[PDB]
Curated annotation (Swiss-Prot):
Domain comment (free text): Contains an N-terminal zinc-binding domain, a central core domain that contains the primase activity, and a C-terminal DnaB-binding domain.
Taxonomic source organism: Aquifex aeolicus (strain VF5)
Binding-site list for Mg(2+) 1: E249, D293
Residues annotated to bind Mg(2+) 2: D293, D295
Cofactor(s), names only, from the UniProt record: Zn(2+); Mg(2+)
Domain of life: Bacteria
Subunit structure: Monomer. Interacts with DnaB.
Protein name: DNA primase
Similarity remark: Belongs to the DnaG primase family.
Domain Toprim: 243-324
């Protein structure tokens, strides 16, 4: 399509805009300086020419060039947009700004509100920390806290973003023109699309309540839980570099592995892996290690997810935690490096079936022939069938499910 704001963003170079305000030192391909928004001793505020964003490793504030100006000048995102449009000789009529654009800006402003709120609340902050999440990871992932509906509503109204935000359904209305934050009182975990745009939130409750321990934004135009993976934006460069991804069950397992420097990690949004999520993962990698809880249900969840991964053409390597351990407890007892080793020592699905079918030929043949049926590569399919046939003498027509 065609929009003033998108055209403005394309024309701006974040390096030129921030350099007007700050003394930027070139460090590698990036620039760094001391943060103007929080106070620390050592320059922690980075500007990436290649990503066209800034990010403070000290307080976690981050965003594009317009957003920097908004924060520096204490004005709204679109107010900052207008100021930059004048500097660049680009048009921007604030009346032509689509609601659509405002939704994303609202999502992002609400993310900043929650982040600030987490820093200010001692119980929430200590909670997150007490759970083994590193403060550096908490900041990278823009973790927050929802302290007040009225506080949130005030920032929305002040920024002229309330009506846009209402399209997300992250706000309830119990009575006319009064609002309650869906995530009230929860530690907030922003959900980003694969390009890093905040599209919604998960919320983990930290108080005793009748409500679910975890909730997500409801599905909508902007947010589809079944089509996104938590951590993909943060993980994708590590996944590419390492040549595989690690799939864990939920956000807390992911945040923990990232806290321990294991960064090529994704998790299903909210729940069980979906086919769309397996398809999406396959666009970044063709090898996935699955690391679910070391109990029955975890093992059963790995078995449900494997055919979705196979169908998407990924090679699967199940990682078996010892009985009773989730990733968090395993890391606490044995250390991050042992988890890396466990993951590495884990055999590929079919190679492991072939190796262990000896245990229970009957049950293991069942599994093998079942998983085999999700391989779209017939050449590979056949070689796997041949190996099993050769080894255990099970007829090719049993293995290929020929009726
Ligand atoms: Zn900062």
């Amino acid at each position: 399509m065609s929009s003033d704001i998108d055209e403005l963003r394309r024309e701006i170079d974040i390096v030129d805009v921030i350099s007007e305000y700050l003394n930027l030192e070139k460090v590698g391909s990036n620039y760094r300086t001391n943060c103007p928004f929080h106070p620390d001793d050592t320059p922690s505020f980075y500007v990436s020419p290649s990503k066209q964003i800034f990010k403070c490793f000290g307080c976690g504030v981050g965003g594009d060039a317009i957003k920097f100006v908004s924060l520096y000048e204490d004005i709204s995102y679109f107010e900052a947009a207008l100021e930059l449009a004048k500097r660049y000789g680009k048009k921007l009529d604030l009346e032509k700004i689509s609601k659509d654009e405002k939704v994303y800006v609202a999502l992002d402003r609400v993310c900043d509100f929650y982040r600030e709120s987490l820093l200010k609340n001692r119980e929430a902050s200590e909670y997150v920390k007490s759970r083994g999440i590193d403060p550096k990871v908490a900041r990278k992932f823009d973790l927050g806290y929802a302290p007040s509906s009225e506080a949130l509503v005030k920032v929305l109204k002040e920024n002229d973003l309330l009506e846009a935000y209402l399209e997300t359904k992250n706000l309830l209305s119990p009575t006319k023109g009064v609002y309650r934050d869906l995530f009230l009182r929860r530690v907030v975990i922003p959900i980003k699309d694969p390009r890093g745009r905040v599209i919604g939130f998960g919320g983990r409750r930290i108080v005793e309540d009748k409500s679910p321990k975890y909730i997500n934004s409801p599905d909508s135009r902007v947010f589809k839980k079944g089509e996104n993976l938590f951590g993909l934006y943060e993980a994708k460069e590590y996944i590419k570099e390492e040549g595989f991804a690690i799939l864990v069950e939920g956000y807390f397992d992911l945040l923990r592995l990232f806290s321990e420097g294991i960064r090529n990690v994704v998790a299903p949004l909210g729940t069980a892996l979906t086919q769309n999520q397996a398809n999406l993962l396959s666009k970044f990698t063709k090898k996935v290690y699955i690391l679910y809880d070391g109990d029955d249900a975890g093992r059963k969840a790995m078995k449900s997810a494997i055919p979705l991964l196979l169908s998407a053409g990924v090679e699967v390597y199940p990682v078996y935690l010892p009985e009773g351990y989730d990733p968090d407890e395993f890391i606490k007892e044995f250390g991050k490096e042992e988890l890396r080793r466990l993951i590495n020592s884990s055999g590929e699905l079919f190679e492991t079936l072939i190796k262990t079918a000896r245990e229970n030929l009957e049950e293991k043949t069942r599994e093998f022939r079942y998983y085999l049926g999700f391989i779209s590569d017939g050449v590979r399919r056949f070689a796997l069938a041949s190996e099993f046939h050769t080894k255990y003498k099970v007829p090719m027509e049993i293995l290929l499910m020929k009726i």
